[PDB]
Each structure stands twice: as structure tokens, then as C-alpha cells.
Design an enzyme around this catalytic site. Structure first.
Site, PDB file in Angstrom:
ATOM      1  N   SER A  62       0.782  -1.249   0.000  1.00  0.00           N
ATOM      2  CA  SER A  62       0.000   0.000   0.000  1.00  0.00           C
ATOM      3  C   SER A  62       0.823   1.314   0.000  1.00  0.00           C
ATOM      4  CB  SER A  62      -1.012   0.005   1.134  1.00  0.00           C
ATOM      5  OG  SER A  62      -2.016  -0.950   0.826  1.00  0.00           O
ATOM      6  N   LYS A  65       0.169   3.397  -2.982  1.00  0.00           N
ATOM      7  CA  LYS A  65      -0.928   4.361  -3.072  1.00  0.00           C
ATOM      8  C   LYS A  65      -0.446   5.822  -3.066  1.00  0.00           C
ATOM      9  CE  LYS A  65      -3.839   0.937  -1.083  1.00  0.00           C
ATOM     10  NZ  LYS A  65      -4.490   0.318   0.121  1.00  0.00           N
ATOM     11  N   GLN A 118     -11.023  -5.741  -1.489  1.00  0.00           N
ATOM     12  CA  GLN A 118     -10.303  -6.228  -2.652  1.00  0.00           C
ATOM     13  C   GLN A 118     -11.226  -6.450  -3.829  1.00  0.00           C
ATOM     14  OE1 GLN A 118      -7.088  -6.183  -2.211  1.00  0.00           O
ATOM     15  NE2 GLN A 118      -6.500  -7.160  -0.278  1.00  0.00           N
ATOM     16  N   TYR A 148     -11.282   1.980   4.257  1.00  0.00           N
ATOM     17  CA  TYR A 148     -10.114   1.632   3.435  1.00  0.00           C
ATOM     18  C   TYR A 148     -10.440   0.469   2.455  1.00  0.00           C
ATOM     19  CZ  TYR A 148      -6.152  -1.140   2.072  1.00  0.00           C
ATOM     20  OH  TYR A 148      -5.317  -1.959   1.332  1.00  0.00           O
ATOM     21  N   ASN A 150      -8.898  -1.279  -1.489  1.00  0.00           N
ATOM     22  CA  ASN A 150      -8.095  -1.278  -2.718  1.00  0.00           C
ATOM     23  C   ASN A 150      -8.979  -1.072  -3.942  1.00  0.00           C
ATOM     24  OD1 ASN A 150      -5.384  -1.658  -1.750  1.00  0.00           O
ATOM     25  ND2 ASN A 150      -5.959  -3.768  -1.260  1.00  0.00           N
ATOM     26  N   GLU A 270      -1.480   9.780   4.329  1.00  0.00           N
ATOM     27  CA  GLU A 270      -2.318  10.032   5.487  1.00  0.00           C
ATOM     28  C   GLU A 270      -1.499  10.936   6.410  1.00  0.00           C
ATOM     29  OE1 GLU A 270      -3.630   6.142   6.971  1.00  0.00           O
ATOM     30  OE2 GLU A 270      -4.224   5.626   4.915  1.00  0.00           O
ATOM     31  N   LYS A 313       2.713   6.374   5.526  1.00  0.00           N
ATOM     32  CA  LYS A 313       1.983   5.318   4.854  1.00  0.00           C
ATOM     33  C   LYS A 313       2.665   4.012   5.157  1.00  0.00           C
ATOM     34  CE  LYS A 313      -1.516   3.819   2.574  1.00  0.00           C
ATOM     35  NZ  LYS A 313      -1.428   2.662   3.500  1.00  0.00           N
ATOM     36  N   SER A 316       2.112  -3.556   2.905  1.00  0.00           N
ATOM     37  CA  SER A 316       2.590  -4.927   3.005  1.00  0.00           C
ATOM     38  C   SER A 316       2.169  -5.726   1.806  1.00  0.00           C
ATOM     39  CB  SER A 316       1.983  -5.603   4.229  1.00  0.00           C
ATOM     40  OG  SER A 316       2.137  -4.850   5.415  1.00  0.00           O
TER      41      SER A 316
END
Length: 359
Positions: A62, A65, A118, A148, A150, A270, A313, A316
Site C-alpha cells: 500500500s 498508493k 479487494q 479503506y 483497494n 495520510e 503510509k 505490506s
């Protein structure tokens, strides 16, 4: 202050972290007074005894992002897209009534109304992807809650590049990677760079999983410690960035779009106000909190990037754990790359300890 003191501070934290978490290899970069310091330990590939080097590629998960947000910000600065634009402007095939009122802003910031975590494993092409979004039933009205996902930020990245006429990977390479000279940062790793691509480990075993739909956009960047240090430098202070649309895009990714408790949602990044209590960021990173659907408060208009922020941020993959954090007001930052996924609270605590001891 001195290189030896910085080295001592970093080693005193990272060596026991690697020992406790059974991390095979790690690469860390510290930005101290705007200058980079690089560190490497252990193995990129256990069975072949390859060490981690400054060229080793790690999967960012992530943290990818952040690249998505900045490319999106650059598209805004070019005049190609607006966050206030409806999703249907870039994907007219999304005729579902539930998509009326949903804007690019909502996709970028996880506030569309409960898009799933997902893309399902069986959705393997564009028509299946369209069918998935067309039959998605929102849980809330747009802007009410942050969840949150994806499938949210992944779709933002895919749509943000549509006016460019380039694929997402090509737009990212030409507009972000090449201007910032990130020569060891890839979405698709070329065959000739496979020798530097670390193996990720899970339960002591090498793990590799083929990428699914929207992987590039949400979770597919791989990078070295040198390029990640350059990425933190550029995001911390873009005044040296010659390409104006990119300098502006970096600033837009750190604008405060929503307030969620003590956290402010940017585009990928963030942020939290600086100074802060370590417990806020450490407890905040626990997956139970990080994945929760929480009320979102819109910042009208988005607050421009605040220098007195902890910008960060986590990310993983099956076999990797990464973390990036920086404080623009202090010209202080950290990149932690590992070829084992280990608890997010542990990453944040280790980063906080190094940065607290350096300041």
C-alpha cells in the site's frame, strides 16, 4: 547530529527489530536535515545467500498508493481531471444509479460508500471489473464514511490516467518516476532487474503470488532504498522539482480532504498534526482500526498541505513489510523496507523511536 550518531540510533533500533521479528533482510533510509543516510542488513535471498544492497528491490504494498496519489495530483495540475468530477465522466459504462453522486474524490479517499477491500479473485478482465462495480451495493451515501479499500483507490488510479491515453504504468513511469530519477522503481520488474528483486518470506518460506486486477494502482510498486529516500525527499519538499505539474501534484496529495479522528486523508498519504502522541499513530496502525468504517468529516475546501504534519503510509504484501514517514517542518524522514511482513504497530513504533532520537 553526526553520521556515526545517526548510524548508532538506526542500528540500536533495527538490529533487535530484525532479531525479534525474524526479518531476513532490511533496508532503511533516514532523511536528516534534508540529507539521505542509507543502511542495509541481512539477506534479500536466503537460499542463494544474496545480501540486501542499496539496489535491492522490495515490494511496497500500500505505500504504492502514495505514487497513485501524486500521479493523480499531477493529472489535476495538468487540467486533465478534477476531484469534483463524477466517476461516470471517466467510465461512462458505470450507468448504475448508485454511481450518481460518486466523484473521483470519493474513490481516492475511500469515501464512496463502502467499496470492498479487494477486487474478487475471479474478476480477471475489464468486463468482469465493470460487472463487479455495476452490481456493488453501497452501505452509505458518498462522503459519510471512510472505509479503506483497494477497489476504491485502485479505480481512482485507473480513471485518473484515462485522459493521458497511456496505461497506468506508462503514465506513472513518464510523469513521476523519470522526472524524479527513480531509476530503480518499477511496477513490472524487467527481467534484467530480477537479480536485485528480493524474495519475500512468510513463516520462513519464500512466497510469491501473481498480481490481480488493479494491482499496479493499489499495491504493485517495487523500489530500492535509494529511490524511496528520493521519494520521501521529493514529497517532503518539492521546491527543487522542476516539473511544475508534478510539484503541484505532490502538494495536492498532502492536502487534507477529510478528518477521521486525529487523522487527515490525503491522496494516498495520510497525515496527522505535528506534534503528536506516539500512541495515536501506533494504535492507529493496528489492522482492526485501519480497516474499520469510520465517520468521515469533509474539509471544505481541502486544507492545503500543512508543514507541521506527521505524513506517513504503511504497506505490506504476502512477503514484505514497508513504512514511510516524514515531518516537513523538521526536514526529517524515514523509509523502512523489509522482506517479511511484520505488525504495523511494530513498524510505526520503531520509526517513531528513530525519528524522536534524531530530533
Amino acid at each position: 547530529k553526526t553520521e556515526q550518531q545517526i548510524a548508532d540510533i538506526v542500528n540500536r533500533t533495527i538490529t533487535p527489530l530484525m532479531q525479534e521479528q525474524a526479518i531476513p533482510g532490511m533496508a532503511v533510509a533516514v532523511i536528516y536535515q534534508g540529507k539521505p543516510y542509507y543502511f542495509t542488513w541481512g539477506k534479500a535471498d536466503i537460499a542463494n545467500n544474496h545480501p540486501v544492497t542499496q539496489q535491492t528491490l522490495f515490494e511496497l504494498g500500500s505505500v504504492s498508493k502514495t505514487f497513485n496519489g501524486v500521479l493523480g495530483g499531477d493529472a489535476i495540475a495538468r487540467g486533465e481531471i478534477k476531484l469534483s468530477d463524477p466517476v461516470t465522466k471517466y467510465w461512462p459504462e458505470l450507468t448504475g444509479k448508485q454511481w450518481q453522486g460518486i466523484r473521483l474524490l470519493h474513490l481516492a479517499t475511500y469515501t464512496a460508500g463502502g467499496l470492498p477491500l479487494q477486487i474478487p479473485d475471479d474478476v480477471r478482465d475489464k468486463a468482469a471489473l465493470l460487472h463487479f462495480y455495476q452490481n456493488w451495493q453501497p452501505q452509505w451515501t458518498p462522503g459519510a464514511k471512510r472505509l479503506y479499500a483497494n477497489s476504491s483507490i485502485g479505480l481512482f488510479g485507473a480513471l485518473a490516467v484515462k485522459p493521458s491515453g497511456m496505461s497506468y504504468e506508462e503514465a506513472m513511469t513518464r510523469r513521476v518516476l523519470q522526472p524524479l530519477k527513480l531509476a530503480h522503481t518499477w511496477i513490472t520488474v524487467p527481467q534484467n532487474e530480477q537479480k536485485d528483486y528480493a524474495w519475500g518470506y512468510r513463516e520462513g518460506k519464500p512466497v510469491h503470488v501473481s498480481p490481480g486486477q488493479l494491482d499496479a494502482e493499489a499495491h504493485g510498486v517495487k523500489s530500492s532504498v535509494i529511490d524511496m529516500a528520493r521519494w520521501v525527499q521529493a514529497n517532503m519538499d518539492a521546491s527543487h522539482v522542476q516539473e511544475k505539474t508534478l510539484q503541484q501534484g505532490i502538494a495536492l496529495a498532502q492536502s487534507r480532504y477529510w478528518r477521521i479522528g486525529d487523522m487527515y486523508q490525503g491522496l494516498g498519504w495520510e497525515m496527522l498534526n505535528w506534534p503528536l502522541k506516539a500512541d495515536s499513530i501506533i494504535n492507529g496502525s493496528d489492522s482492526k482500526v485501519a480497516l474499520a468504517a469510520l465517520p468521515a468529516v469533509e474539509v471544505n475546501p481541502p486544507a492545503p498541505a500543512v508543514k507541521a504534519s506527521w505524513v506517513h503510509k504503511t504497506g505490506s504484501t504476502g512477503g514484505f513489510g514497508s513504512y514511510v514517514a516524514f515531518v516537513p517542518e523538521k526536514n526529517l524522514g524515514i523509509v523502512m523496507l523489509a522482506n517479511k511482513s511484520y505488525p504495523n504497530p511494530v513498524r510505526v513504533e520503531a520509526a517513531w523511536r528513530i525519528l524522536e532520537k534524531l530530533q
